[PDB]
Amino acid sequence: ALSEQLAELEKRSGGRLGVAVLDTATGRRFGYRGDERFPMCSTFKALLAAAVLARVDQGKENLDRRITYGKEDLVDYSPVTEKHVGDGMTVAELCEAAITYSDNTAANLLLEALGGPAALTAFLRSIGDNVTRLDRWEPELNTAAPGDPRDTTTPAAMAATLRTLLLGDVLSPASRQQLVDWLIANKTGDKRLRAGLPADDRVGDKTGTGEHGTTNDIAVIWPPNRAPILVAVYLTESQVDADARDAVIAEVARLVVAAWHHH
C-alpha cells in the first residue's frame, strides 16, 4: 500500500522522506514518518504570514505599513525585495514575496515585525502546535544538519497547524482568504506537489529548500467543489540531484492521489 510505495520511493531518494495527509472532508489522515522532525526551510513562511495576519486582526499591525531597507538587509535569494530597496515594500507585499517566491529578506523583515523566531514559536504554541519550532533567521535556518531539532516541524504537526490556520477560527475570514490567496499564487512549486496533482485541482502550496539535500512542499488542495486536503512532504539527506529531489515530491503527490481512496 501507500506506505510501502513511499518506502520504495524513499530508498531511491537516498534520504529521509516524511509525508502527512489530512483530509478535512472527514478528518481521515495518513502519516509516513509523520512524527519525525524535519527541517522546515522556507515552509515556515506560511506560518510566519499567518502570525503577521493574526497581529493585523488584533490591530497591532497594518498590511499597508511600508518597511524600508537597504542592500545591507538583503539575504541571498531575495528575488522580489532586491528590486525594491529604493521604495521599500508593504507588510502585505512582503508576505506575498515570502510565500510565493521564498524571498529570504521578506521573511527576515517579517520576523523582525513579529519579534523574531521566538515570537513565531510562541504564536504556534498559542494555537496548539507544541512541536514546530523556529530558532534561527534566514539563511541559517536552512542548514538542515542531521540530528538538529532547530527550525523543524513534523509532517503531521505542520498539516494540523495548516488546518487550524486556514480553516479554523485563529484568523479572521479575510486573513484566512488572504493566506489562501498567497499560497494559491505560489511560483516556486511547479516541479513539486503540483506536478503530481490532477489538473482540475486548485492548489496552494509553500516549498522549502535547504542544505543536506532538503526539498519540501506543503499544500492545501481543493478538488472540484470538495472540502480541501492538506499534504505536507519533507525530504532531507537526499543523495540525488535537485531535479530528482523535485521529482520525489511530485511522485509523492501522484502516489497520494492514487491511494487516497483507501480507507
Residue numbers in the entry: 28 to 58, 60 to 238, 240 to 252, 254 to 293
Manuscript text:
Here, we explore and test these notions using resurrected Precambrian β-lactamases11 as scaffolds for the engineering of completely new active sites. A hydrophobic-to-ionizable amino acid replacement generates a buried (or partially buried) residue with the perturbed properties that are useful in catalysis and conformational flexibility assists the generation of a completely new active site by facilitating substrate and transition-state binding. We have shown that, when using resurrected Precambrian β-lactamases as scaffolds for protein engineering, a minimalist design approach based on this mechanism leads to levels of catalysis for the Kemp elimination reaction of up to approximately seven orders of magnitude above the rate of the uncatalysed reaction, as well as to significant ester hydrolysis activity.
Finally, catalysis of Kemp elimination is enhanced by an additional F290W amino replacement in the neighbourhood of position 229, which likely stabilizes the transition state through a face-to-edge interaction with the new tryptophan residue. Furthermore, the double W229/F290W variant of the GNCA4 scaffold is the most active Kemp eliminase reported in this work with a rate enhancement of about seven orders of magnitude over the rate of the uncatalysed reaction. Regarding the turnover numbers, the kcat values obtained for the W229D/F290W variants of the ancestral β-lactamase scaffolds are up to approximately seven orders of magnitude above the rate of the uncatalysed reaction. Unlike previous rationally designed Kemp eliminases, our best eliminase displays a maximum catalytic efficiency (∼5, 500 M−1 s−1) that exceeds the acetate in acetonitrile level. We therefore determined the Michaelis–Menten parameters for the degradation of a penicillin antibiotic (benzylpenicillin) and one third-generation antibiotic (cefotaxime) catalysed by GNCA4-W229D/F290W. The catalytic efficiency for the hydrolysis of p-nitrophenyl acetate at the new active site, kcat/KM=11.7±1.1 M−1 s−1, is similar to the best values reported in the literature for rationally designed esterases. Furthermore, the turnover number at the new active site, kcat=7.6 × 10−3±2 × 10−4 s−1, indicates a three orders of magnitude enhancement over the rate of the non-enzymatic reaction (kuncat=2.5 × 10−6 s−1).
